[PDB]
Amino acid sequence: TEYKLVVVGADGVGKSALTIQLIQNHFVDEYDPTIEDSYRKQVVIDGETCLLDILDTAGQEEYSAMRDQYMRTGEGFLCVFAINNTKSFEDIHHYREQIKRVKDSEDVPMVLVGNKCDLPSRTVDTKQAQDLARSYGIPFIETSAKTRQGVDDAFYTLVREIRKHKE
Ligand X SMILES: Nc1nc2c(ncn2[C@@H]2O[C@H](COP(=O)(O)OP(=O)(O)O)[C@@H](O)[C@H]2O)c(=O)[nH]1
Residue 65 site contact among ligand X, Mg ion, none (CB < 5 to 8 Å, cut-off depends on kind): Mg ion
Near ligand X in 148-167, by CB under 6 A: none
Going edge to edge, which strands form the sheet with 48-54?
Answer: 27-31, 39-45, 48-54, 3-9, 76-82, 110-115, 140-142
Residue 13 site contact among Mg ion, ligand X, none (CB < 5 to 8 Å, cut-off depends on kind): ligand X
Q: Which is nearer to Mg ion, 37 or 65 (CB)?
A: 65
One of 28, 35, 44, 119 touching ligand X (CB under 6 A): 119
End-to-end CA separation in angstroms for the chain: 14
Q: Which is nearer to Mg ion, 1 or 58 (CB)?
A: 58
Binding mask 25-64 for ligand X (x = CB under 6 A): ----------------------------------------
Residue 13 in contact with ligand X, rule: CB under 6 A: yes
Residue 145 site contact among ligand X, Mg ion, none (CB < 5 to 8 Å, cut-off depends on kind): ligand X
The string of DSSP letters for 49-62 reads EEEEEE---SGGGG
Near Mg ion in 54-83, by CB under 5 A: 65
Q: Residues binding Mg ion: what is the number (CB under 5 A)?
A: 1
Helix and strand element counts for the chain (H, E): 6, 7
Give the angle 61-67-69 at the CA atoms, nearest 5°.
Answer: 130
